């Protein structure tokens, strides 16, 4: 269960106050003593201190407003280290991408998305929920977002092991419990591409995607 990252998309021209959380790094089986270390352009190199990571929780924050015309992307790296400072999970690239303030495409902000399902789980078992934008914000309601699993890899033993609720973003199993079994699964980890599309509102038709993994567990 190594370090898991997602690209961090940050709208340009964020307002006060700062810092704000923009993403997160996962490493669930991190040993005790372990801490996260973030490095790169915008971190320990120029523009210094633009981004920080909570060394304990792996939450990534931005400390100032960004202008996409100034820097459009930042290549960050994250590792875990000992209490001393010795590297445990060698550095993993992590990109920050500054979004144009006129780019209103839906964004899944809560990744990396990592799901788990017990083998033999009943058909209709909820694995996880993935949704785009905030929700509870100035209404995300207006977008009428609808969700779809664009791709599942591997495409075996069924091409559609899961189904995302179009409205809610709840990912459920749709195969017999008998099919959910590590030993008979050629690959027990699935990579999904999930898409959100605005079905109404001023940004009707805009789409965004994220990846998720789902592991069938013992």
3-state SS, one letter per residue, for the chain: CCCECCCEEEECCCCCCCCEEEEECECCCCCCCCEEEEEEECCCECCCCCEEECCCCCEEEECCCCCCCCCCEEEEEEEEECCCCCECCCCEEEEEEEECCCCCCCCCCCCCEEEEEECCCCCCCEEEECCCCCCCCCCHHHHCEEEEEEEEECCCCCCCCEEECCCCCEEEECCCHHHCCHHHCCCCEEEEEEEEEECCCCCCCCEEEEEEEEEEEC
Q: Are 108 and 186 in a shared domain? A: yes
Q: Are 94 and 121 in a shared domain? A: no
* Residue span of the structural domain in which 10 resides: 1-101
Q: Are 169 and 68 in a shared domain? A: no
Q: Are 26 and 1 in a shared domain? A: yes
Residue pair 27/36 in contact (Cβ under 8 Å)? The answer is: yes
Residue pair 194/207 in contact (Cβ under 8 Å)? The answer is: no
Experiment used for this model: X-ray
Q: Are 94 and 150 in a shared domain? A: no
Please, how many CA atoms are within 13 Å of residue 101, restricted to the half-sphere of its CB? Answer: 9
Q: Are 120 and 95 in a shared domain? A: no
Tokens read off for 37: 């270390």
Q: Are 76 and 113 in a shared domain? A: no
- Angle, alpha carbons 20-23-24 (nearest 5°): 120
Q: Among 101, 132, 160, identify where a domain stops.
A: 101
Q: Are 209 and 110 in a shared domain? A: yes
- CATH of residue 77's domain is 2.60.40.60
Question: What resolution in angstroms, rounded to 1 decimal?
Answer: 2.0
What is the tally of structural domains in the chain?
2
Q: Among 66, 84, 101, identify where a domain stops.
A: 101
């Amino acid at each position: 269960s190594g370090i898991v990252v997602s690209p961090i998309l940050i709208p340009e021209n964020q307002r006060q106050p700062f810092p704000r959380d923009v993403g997160k790094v996962v490493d669930s089986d991190r040993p005790e003593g372990s801490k996260f270390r973030l490095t790169g352009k915008g971190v320990d190199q120029d523009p210094k201190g633009t981004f920080r990571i909570n060394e304990n929780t792996g939450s990534v924050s931005v400390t100032r407003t960004l202008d996409r015309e100034t820097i459009a992307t930042y290549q960050l790296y994250v590792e875990t280290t000992d209490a001393s400072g010795k590297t445990l999970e060698g550095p993993v690239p992590l990109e920050v991408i500054v979004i144009d303030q006129n780019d209103n495409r839906p964004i899944f902000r809560e990744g990396p998305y990592i799901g788990h399902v017990m083998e033999g789980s009943p058909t209709g078992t909820t694995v996880m929920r993935m949704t785009a934008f905030d929700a509870d914000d100035p209404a995300t309601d207006n977008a009428l977002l609808r969700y779809n699993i664009r791709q599942q890899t591997p495409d075996k033993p069924s091409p559609n092991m899961f189904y995302i609720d179009p409205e809610k973003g709840d990912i459920v199993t749709v195969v017999s419990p008998a099919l959910l079994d590590r030993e008979t699964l050629e690959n027990p980890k699935y990579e999904l591409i999930i898409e959100a599309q605005d079905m109404a509102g001023l940004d009707v038709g805009l789409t965004g995607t994220a990846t998720a993994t789902i592991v069938i567990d013992d």
